[PDB]
Amino acid sequence: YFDDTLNKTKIKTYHSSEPAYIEEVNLIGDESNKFQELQTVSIKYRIRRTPQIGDKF
Amino acid sequence: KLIGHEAKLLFLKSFQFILKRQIRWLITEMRFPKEFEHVAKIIWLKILKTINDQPQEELKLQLHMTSTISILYLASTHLSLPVYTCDYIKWICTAKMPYFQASEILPKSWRIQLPNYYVSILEGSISPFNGQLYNKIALTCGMIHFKEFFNSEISCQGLLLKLVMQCALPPEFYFYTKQVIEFEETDIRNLTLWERTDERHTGRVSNHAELRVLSYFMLTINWMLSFDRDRQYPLKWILSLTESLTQRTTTSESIGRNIVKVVYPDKPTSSDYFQWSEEETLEFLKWMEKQFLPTQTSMEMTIDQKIARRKLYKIFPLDREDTHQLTFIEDLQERYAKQTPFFPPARKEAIGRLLTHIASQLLVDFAISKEQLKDCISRIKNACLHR
Amino acid sequence: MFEVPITLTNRKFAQRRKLKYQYINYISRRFDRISKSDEERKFWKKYEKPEKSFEIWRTVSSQNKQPINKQKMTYHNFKKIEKIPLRKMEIPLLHCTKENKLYFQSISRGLEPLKTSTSEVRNYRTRHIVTLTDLLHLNVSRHNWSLAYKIFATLIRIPGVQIKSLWGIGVEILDNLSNSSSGLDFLQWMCQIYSSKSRFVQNINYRSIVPPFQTGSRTHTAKFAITYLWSSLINCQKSMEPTENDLLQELIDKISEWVLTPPFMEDAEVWFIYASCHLLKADTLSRQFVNDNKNNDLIGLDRDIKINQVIKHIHYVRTFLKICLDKGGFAVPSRLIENQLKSFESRLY
Amino acid sequence: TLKYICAECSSKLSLSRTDAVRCKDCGHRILLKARTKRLVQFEAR
Amino acid sequence: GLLNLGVKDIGEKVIFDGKPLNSNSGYLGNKLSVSVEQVSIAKPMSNDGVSSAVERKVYPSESRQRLTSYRGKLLLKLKWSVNNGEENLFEVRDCGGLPVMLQSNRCHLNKMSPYELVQHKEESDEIGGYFIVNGIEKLIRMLIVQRRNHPMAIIRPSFANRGASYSHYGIQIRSVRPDQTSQTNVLHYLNDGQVTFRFSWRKNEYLVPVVMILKALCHTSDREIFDGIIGNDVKDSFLTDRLELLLRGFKKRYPHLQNRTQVLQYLGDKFRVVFQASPDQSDLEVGQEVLDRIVLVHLGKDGSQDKFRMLLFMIRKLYSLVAGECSPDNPDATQHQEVLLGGFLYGMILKEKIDEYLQNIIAQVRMDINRGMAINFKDKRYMSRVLMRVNENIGS
Ligand SMILES: [Zn+2]
């Protein structure tokens, strides 16, 4: 993304213990009065979970 | 979006372009080679010459909706391909000209150049009234000094033909009126386009050649029919022509003249509006579904609005929720036959009745002056009696 | 000749009623005194607006109101009031066009203009559109369905239509158009469009859209939304009682969505139609359980669960008809509906 | 051409930094970012 | 539905401009009766920008994907009554978005077949019943509460925790009004034979001698109350003497309460400060309104002989517990209990919030009259301005 105040292209880093896959990216303009600049985005992560030592059964 | 000199330059430019678009449909329309194209180009090159000179901050150029066709008109006369009334009716009927709406441009952008003071005041403001159209031609000639530059102005033995065929195309009346024209009509010489009426009050010098041609045309008819001592034109013959005349479909032409009638002017065709002979009604809606399709394309009325509009047109699928009609010379032939039985107070009345009709027709294609026309008539009336 | 789809070439007409009003507040004042743009808004603030209808028709039977005034008008007395407002109309006459000087001097003499402002406008787009209007009005005045539809469909494609006759000829043309569409759809599309749930009346110079025949969603009913419900109940009646059904429910839940705000909010047919739809839903269920005791020989059929479902309704309807009366609803001839409903009860026995 | 599907109309579109976040075919205000022909490697486990 | 009974139960909230006029100075005047006649709730809709826009039904799928609440516009027909009827003003006020239960009479999915439900991107079998609040699915947990309207005999050391001369024995009846709002009423047997009645007002507790609430319900003789309790049981020396202590003791405390009306005047006088009825109601009205709002509200208004009979039944049950001729019940036995349903709690909390909201209007009038007193109860401007000056977003 880009904030004019910083004149910089900034990024939101992913902070987690495990890799994932992006399932959906949803662009939210709804319930807004105008908001056309698309300031809200919802991103879904798909984390595969293989049965593993320590999993409860 | 700019004011002053450079606003004017693009105002200028846009005017530049639409005329060019006008000219090329001109070529496809008539197909009269490099010639029609290049003469038109230098004509405006000549027109531009004058605009630059009185520049500084001269903004009188704001040439009108009519200036462009006057330009094409004069260029055509140089060449002398056609006529004015015919050209105008044809153009309105088929929207041949991009004349009436100025959105074409190629400007999307020129539009935004803020139609401001000018470009907004361009393309399609309104339809010509009285002399609001022959006057401009005179002004163009004056700036143009057109008569010196171009040969045989306002001429056309073709307008006479157009006119006789126009209705009671009494083959003999072509030569009759050609003869009276021969007569005192500028000492038996083809009327040339009037001069560069430099003066701004545009007096009715009444030199617009055609205007006088139609006048001689009318005069000829009643004089000719008002002293056909030999009785070559039967009592019952005159009303038959007016009879058969009683409107009728049109292999394109009459439908056009209806479309011109519909500029709701002085109410001579207004009622035709009302009447509108059945189908005339139908082929009218046909020409509306084809030629005000351009109509337009709201941008900036939330996408949502546009969608709604679409839906509306949606739930109105519409457009369909002898080839029948006939051509021009077909109709012309068939009324020429509808009178084919050829071989006191009443006839005078009939003659007056008929003349009013043509007055309607010829006047209706043109700036009329339900008086000037008359004034024009009066004028040569006076001109004539100096035998 | 007919009513045109467009904002009235706002050029001379706007300065003509500057002069009209300004004179009426000038002569209006001195006359009131003896009895001891801006001016136009003040003229309406001295008279009170047109409520949601047409002509402030309201009875003719309450207050006596003694108006013997006294003819109080001695040619001499009129020219005492008038002698000074006319000289004050001059100053702004100097500033007005020669056509508007004569127009003012005609209406100040009491002459009326036989020159319809919509009989001179000379604009291409407008030009035709007046073509457009009379052709469709002359075509519905002879029921030409196949041609009235084409003229209507083109009239909305040109940039000059405010619902207007867009809806009032757009519905019949679809009733006369035995082919495609139920004014209903078009009627429900209109309803979606001009809800106007906002209570806007008065204030500015409504001279672009007056006809309470478009507008509302405030208080002033919309009449295409009332016609949508009336056409919808008549669309439910045809070939009912001679899952894919739903319509008489669709209309019970589409009227619900409302339940007053603007429509519920305002009374009448809103309540009365909803009921009438509800009363029809009561008959249909007496028929579907009517003929020769329900269908025939008795019901044994778990006695009647169906009678109890119908008596609940009949008792409910009578509540909707009553609240429509109580809240000032003059629409309903109660005597006939109560007799019909009781004689119908006597079918359910 | 980047793609965004209308959550309620399925209509494909190509949003710009200059347009309203809305389905031009329905009017919804929720748009799924479309998958494209893009390479991804996978360990088949 | 229950909610319209609730707003019928909140009644009125009256405020006087001290209505000057210059009896109009010790009876003054100009009444303003504010209430709510109807309360309507509409199914979730969303119109674009702001107004004039065509509305669309809003679906739960939208709220979840959008991560937002699933709100329905809350509307209520406000009654603004001036001078008991000199002028009535109706107003449908929108009170913000009330979260609606799924598959309820307020969810679009209430009547959708699985096929349509799938057509709306839902679990083909979605039971619903829960709320989308800020996109997070929450349901209101059902709760186990005392079975309503029926006296449960309880021994509780709290009863001694009231003070000296308190026994453990006591009766608890949880009277619930039609609207499902509850009011717990307790009877206590004092060691002294005195019986005191516990109740709660403005969620503070209040104790009154039961013989006062008896003489307050209906005009009766002492023999009618005595006969009401012991009746044919003329052999209970235990009860004969305790009940003589009760009635004679009341004759000791209040020799001057000679008739029921006077008693009502005593109750109105002692609760007038807290029942907020003042500058409008007489001690007779305040007292009787108290009885009507507290004592066995499950019996309802004008049940005052019936409420009298029931209260006597609780006195008899209480003495039968005291002797020990009957066991006490167990509040924790499922036997003695009913279930506060989430939606009912919802309706109660709405009723209370609308009561506070009308009180809030009353506060707004108080501030306006205390800084200007500029405007009369009649102004339509006053309705619009005052209404626009209190906060009415109860939906949020
Ligand atoms: Zn869509």
Side-chain angles (χ1 to χ4, degrees), chain D residues 6 8-11 23 25-28:
Chain D
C6 166
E8 182 61 13
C9 79
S10 309
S11 317
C23 168
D25 206 3
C26 70
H28 201 65

Side-chain angles (χ1 to χ4, degrees), chain C residues 305-322:
Chain C
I305 67 85
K306 55 192 190 303
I307 291 179
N308 189 18
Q309 181 175 2
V310 174
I311 290 175
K312 165 186 53 46
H313 178 297
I314 290 170
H315 172 72
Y316 200 32
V317 80
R318 285 185 295 98
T319 304
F320 303 145
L321 179 61
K322 194 189 64 68

Side-chain angles (χ1 to χ4, degrees), chain C residues 191-200 253-254 257 259-261 265 327, chain E residues 38 40 42-43 45 47 51-55 57 75 77 91-92 111 380:
Chain C
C191 287
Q192 244 42 273
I193 169 40
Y194 307 167
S195 143
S196 83
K197 267 175 200 199
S198 58
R199 72 171 65 199
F200 81 94
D253 286 357
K254 286 211 67 52
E257 289 181 316
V259 194
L260 188 147
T261 280
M265 294 300 293
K327 297 174 55 45
Chain E
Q38 201 193 324
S40 283
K43 299 191 188 174
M45 298 311 185
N47 53 347
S51 268
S52 288
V54 56
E55 284 177 354
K57 295 173 171 161
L75 285 87
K77 187 187 196 169
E91 179 73 1
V92 182
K111 275 178 189 179
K380 186 47 174 180

Side-chain angles (χ1 to χ4, degrees), chain C residues 1 22 67 83 114 137 143 145 155 161 201 222 285 289 304 330 338 342:
Chain C
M1 70 186 192
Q22 202 190 348
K83 158 171 274 194
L114 60 80
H137 288 297
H143 305 287
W145 63 102
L155 183 65
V161 164
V201 206
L285 288 187
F289 182 92
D304 287 285
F330 318 70
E338 185 180 40
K342 186 178 179 181

Side-chain angles (χ1 to χ4, degrees), chain E residues 145-372:
Chain E
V145 285
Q146 203 201 307
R147 167 173 294 266
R148 70 182 53 197
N149 318 329
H150 182 284
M152 177 186 76
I154 53 168
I155 60 165
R156 264 182 76 166
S158 47
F159 294 175
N161 207 352
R162 193 61 201 74
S165 293
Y166 286 86
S167 72
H168 293 293
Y169 303 110
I171 306 299
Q172 189 166 358
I173 183 166
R174 180 174 165 280
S175 301
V176 310
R177 302 186 191 84
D179 63 353
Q180 305 303 327
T181 52
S182 183
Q183 185 80 45
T184 292
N185 289 167
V186 196
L187 296 185
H188 293 83
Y189 173 82
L190 305 188
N191 194 28
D192 194 8
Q194 171 69 290
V195 175
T196 53
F197 174 82
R198 282 172 73 82
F199 70 100
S200 295
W201 182 244
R202 290 297 188 258
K203 53 184 190 193
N204 174 29
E205 307 182 349
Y206 296 104
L207 201 67
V208 187
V210 81
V211 175
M212 192 181 294
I213 311 296
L214 289 164
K215 283 176 183 297
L217 284 169
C218 203
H219 176 88
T220 44
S221 64
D222 297 315
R223 186 54 148 134
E224 286 170 344
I225 296 174
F226 182 82
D227 281 340
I229 296 166
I230 186 171
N232 188 349
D233 203 4
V234 301
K235 210 180 186 187
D236 208 320
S237 328
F238 177 104
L239 197 160
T240 306
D241 291 344
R242 288 163 170 81
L243 186 58
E244 188 184 341
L245 292 149
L246 196 66
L247 291 178
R248 283 295 284 187
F250 171 80
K251 290 184 71 82
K252 181 159 297 296
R253 190 161 171 75
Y254 301 106
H256 53 82
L257 295 188
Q258 304 190 337
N259 70 39
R260 162 160 187 291
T261 325
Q262 299 164 335
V263 165
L264 287 168
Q265 290 171 316
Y266 184 74
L267 282 181
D269 176 73
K270 269 77 201 175
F271 297 110
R272 187 180 61 251
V273 281
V274 76
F275 272 78
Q276 198 187 356
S278 253
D280 191 6
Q281 297 194 338
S282 58
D283 287 345
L284 175 51
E285 292 152 344
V286 178
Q288 179 61 68
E289 163 284 333
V290 181
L291 271 74
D292 296 341
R293 196 178 302 283
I294 299 295
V295 184
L296 305 187
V297 293
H298 72 277
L299 298 179
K301 279 167 181 200
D302 185 45
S304 304
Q305 296 176 336
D306 273 344
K307 282 170 169 201
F308 176 77
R309 287 182 186 151
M310 184 55 159
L311 178 62
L312 292 173
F313 186 85
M314 306 200 308
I315 299 157
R316 179 51 147 147
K317 187 167 188 203
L318 178 53
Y319 289 155
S320 307
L321 171 76
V322 165
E325 50 160 340
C326 69
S327 284
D329 307 346
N330 177 357
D332 309 308
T334 321
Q335 163 183 355
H336 294 100
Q337 296 177 315
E338 71 169 340
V339 177
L340 183 76
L341 300 183
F344 297 167
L345 185 61
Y346 187 62
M348 286 159 82
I349 187 66
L350 282 163
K351 196 192 169 191
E352 187 73 11
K353 300 295 286 185
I354 303 175
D355 193 67
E356 178 187 359
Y357 174 64
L358 297 161
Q359 200 172 359
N360 283 346
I361 286 162
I362 286 279
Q364 179 65 254
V365 176
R366 185 174 288 150
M367 175 183 60
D368 185 7
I369 66 191
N370 290 345
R371 299 185 177 181

Side-chain angles (χ1 to χ4, degrees), chain E residues 14-19 28-32 279-280 365 369 377:
Chain E
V14 189
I15 190 168
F16 284 97
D17 182 58
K19 301 301 290 187
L28 213 109
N30 290 284
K31 179 167 152 163
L32 165 60
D280 191 6
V365 176
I369 66 191
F377 301 164

